[model samples]
Target: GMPQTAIGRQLVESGMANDVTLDNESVVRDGIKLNELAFKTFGESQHIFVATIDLNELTFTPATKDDKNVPATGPESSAPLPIHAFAAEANGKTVWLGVNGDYYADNPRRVMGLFYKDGVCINSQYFEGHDEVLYQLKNGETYVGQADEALAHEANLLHALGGYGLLVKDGVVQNFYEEMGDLQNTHPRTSVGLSQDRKTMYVFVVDGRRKDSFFALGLTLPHLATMMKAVGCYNAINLDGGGSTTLIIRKVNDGGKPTFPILNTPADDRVPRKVTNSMLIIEKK
Candidate 1:
């Protein structure tokens, strides 16, 4: 069957993918819509979990150790934590979803991206040449662009985070065939995208490195880029992937009990790894 987005239609029409399913929507909250996509491409099955957030109705913030909202100054100061832990410290608010943030270093234990929290732009110049950052402005505007462009608006930013691998730019799928060699190969992935009007945000978690037929085999950067574009992303960037890829959401049981759980099948021994930072989706008052 034909999917809703332009890219979805193209995939089916061009025979690049089969058994296409899209827009399996779930109302996670008033302002957020969760959608699932499963298909067969390149002779491998794939699944993608997408969270679409309406910026006018929800708030996006970065969460870190102890809810400090601070960047790591050194290895001694930064310790990796699970996504559920970050969501747990949401100060008694509903955290609809959260995903691992930027790429990080092991020895230094630092997130290698622009980390802006509450008016402080820590790590402002860290790896600017290789990363694209998404910035949330004090005036309630959201922007996704290159590091320099994002930095120019630092004076008015409320929150921001850096991500590697520009997936899609201005609606075009990016190819890193030359610059990033091994990274281009397929594996688990976490990426963030923004609609052209900047009114919506899309977070995609692609499951990979599994043997089961129903599970995904992951995606190369170019393939991931195509999927991001099909979902109508004008701009998208990749975060820390592999075992570091994780997405957590609030779930309610039959007895009306609520629990926060990791939604994807993590490749790190099927366990969600401790991460340095996460991007959280919060309910707006």
Candidate 2:
């Protein structure tokens, strides 16, 4: 993968990128500044990416395979739907940043999902991978049965895809880590977390599977939580990772139109792994 800081410099020297694209705006939040970093991670070896979207006013939406262009199964119907591709599919498209969501790898569904867009439950439940996928039931209401039923009536954020488990919740690690005959391994990882009030959100894509600046090896579930908590997440959840990990932001091209500048070099060469859904952060019009 690319060196995080080195590549970030190119965004400035090239003049083709900006905060909308590969940003390092550690600006501010509620009372203190939220950590918006584009440095290295997983050992500070590979160039990784992160962005703390100011959710103080913006809305986080869900874009899943249930859309017309993509479906629940079959690569032909929907294979390789990158995060940016899914975000731009919205009418008038306003998504600015996103992280690949869900585990379309093993199966095209999440153990228990609570998806909502524009104040409605699109597909509150859909899972079909393995029992190992349900390892996150204790994370929060999103994975817990009927927890979101009351909240979905007026929802703002929930999850899809899958999670290894809650890395950090209330600034504490969840003491539940094990191998599912073995589904746990150290590679790349993508995770989500938030401040106590949920006003600020943290998105992380820790690079792995190669050796360089940080480590030839990557991160484990326990270490993943440690890093996130150190960065200041009272609540955190690991999203689908490995080759499935991706992070992107909206960029403007020479023509003055919008384009996506992929920040992380996916584990699968330089191409993004086709995923079933993506969690998007949209800047309102």
Candidate 3:
């Protein structure tokens, strides 16, 4: 069940992790800011990691199991691949940041809902009433809406990925949190948000399923929405979470070789899960 923030803050004031460690923020690069937050709520704790990317300095690319963006037609439409591996085979471009993209299942092993990369419809299946899409345009514009609405901008759509739910809409939390079940329960989460002006993009992840005192317990959908709103996001969408929630950043060595390292603790048996697809941020050369 979802817990209120008052309890969380009360625990924070009792000598917790400093009640929002805003000072822990670091500038990853000229246009990238990384932040972390930890607090206890509902008798449990949570750790959140956020990466704010300036779209002007970074470009968003959707990567599939294959390097190519071609739509799959065979039984193995998509294979599970690790995030760091996706960064390694990123078509010679350096991946500045990366996170899991869409909800998925086995059988044919394909990503759920609409996925467009470089103006190509890699995955055209859209789950109405269950999925929302975020569209990145070539003309420096971004839109978060339904699949049909997103396709209207297809002429200029640079990249688009389907999110599990619309967490926030125009600064308001949607109905995604009104029900009870897995969504209402606390769990690790991954979400993407856009500022009102669409210049800044935010990727967030929280660790969960750990009972140890040092790790996080997880977060509910309502809590996830409020946090996004607190961070200046006008619109936010929930991506693949639970075992699939992962965040990674690029670290360049002195020799100029780039390495992608996982930032958050993934709860999938304490390991990073191989996901079907991912949204990657590439540094603009």
Candidate 4:
């Protein structure tokens, strides 16, 4: 069953109960007016932060900042520096913390996962390629690319949200290239599927503007965890959202209009600027 909070009620009342919806009047209502869910899920204890970075205003710092050069892991010529970044914590442990870098190579497809312990980044791994699926062992030693057939099926899970590639794992990275239906358009982005215990995540989406006009910009982490215990996700994290930001799905209520319908005729022309970095999920296998 769907949640029953005011926003959840409104979602039913407003008739927008699709798997994914965007850029509608309810977006303002659900994302802005109601502070119910985040409060219920994350409980007021977890920390959340959001920032709008200017591509031009960004300045890179050498991996080595204090006369100490940070070691490089990839090809020798790769420059080690920082770019766009954000962080947060859940369940008394550090999770969902990472920074996006401007560094690019060849096709420029890579998702870097950094696991931190005791305020220090202890595990760091970089997966590169256009395929959306990959797996990492619990021991952190085995890294293997997945099969195309599995990837194609996994991508289908997100067809309702926007047909792009999706990655899924139960205990092993068994699927990759899971393509559902295509979004109105394509833009570079990434996402994280959370476990059922955390019950929170930050959602970032683009409002479609030529310049600084943003339809909406903020975090979507829920505050209370008990109100909607069956929401399937205990915790989730949103990757970089912008023109790549999209949400489309069937409405949850009757008389409800399509959420975030494609704008402009021949929606195929509406392409968002591609992002070079993404944050993906990898499970044990």
lDDT for each residue of candidate 2 in 1-285, tens digit (9 for 90 to 100): 222353355423433223332234343322222223233333234434556666655545555544432334455333343434543545655656667765543444432343344444444454432212111112232221122333433444333334446567667865465542233677778888776766666677777776333332456777666656655567777667778777766666689666665667677755677776667666545
Q: Model 3 TM-score?
A: 0.85
Task: Report lDDT (CA) for all predictions.
Answer: 0.75, 0.52, 0.72, 0.24
lDDT of 4 by residue, 118-181 (tens): 1222223423432322222222311112324223333232111111223223322222333322
> Candidate 1 local accuracy as lDDT?
0.75
RMSD of 1: 3.0
lDDT pick, better of 1 and 4: 1
Give a tens-digit lDDT track for model 3, residues 1-285. 222244234324434334342224677778888876676655566787778889888877777766577765555444443443453355676777788878865655666768888788877767545468878777757777777777777577778888877888998977665543576688888899898988888888877888334478887777777777667678999888888888877788899876778777778766677677788777665
Which one wins by lDDT: 2 or 3? 3
**Model 1 weakest 10-residue run by lDDT:** 78-87
Q: Which 10-residue span in candidate 2 carries the lowest summed lDDT?
A: 130-139
Ranking by TM-score: 1, 3, 2, 4
The candidate that achieves the highest TM-score relative to the unseen native structure? 1
TM-score of each: 0.87, 0.68, 0.85, 0.25
Per-model C-alpha RMSD: 3.0, 8.5, 4.9, 18.8
- Candidate with the larger TM-score of 1 and 4: 1
Q: List the residue pairs that clash in candidate 2.
A: 4-47, 45-213, 45-214, 80-274, 102-161, 211-216
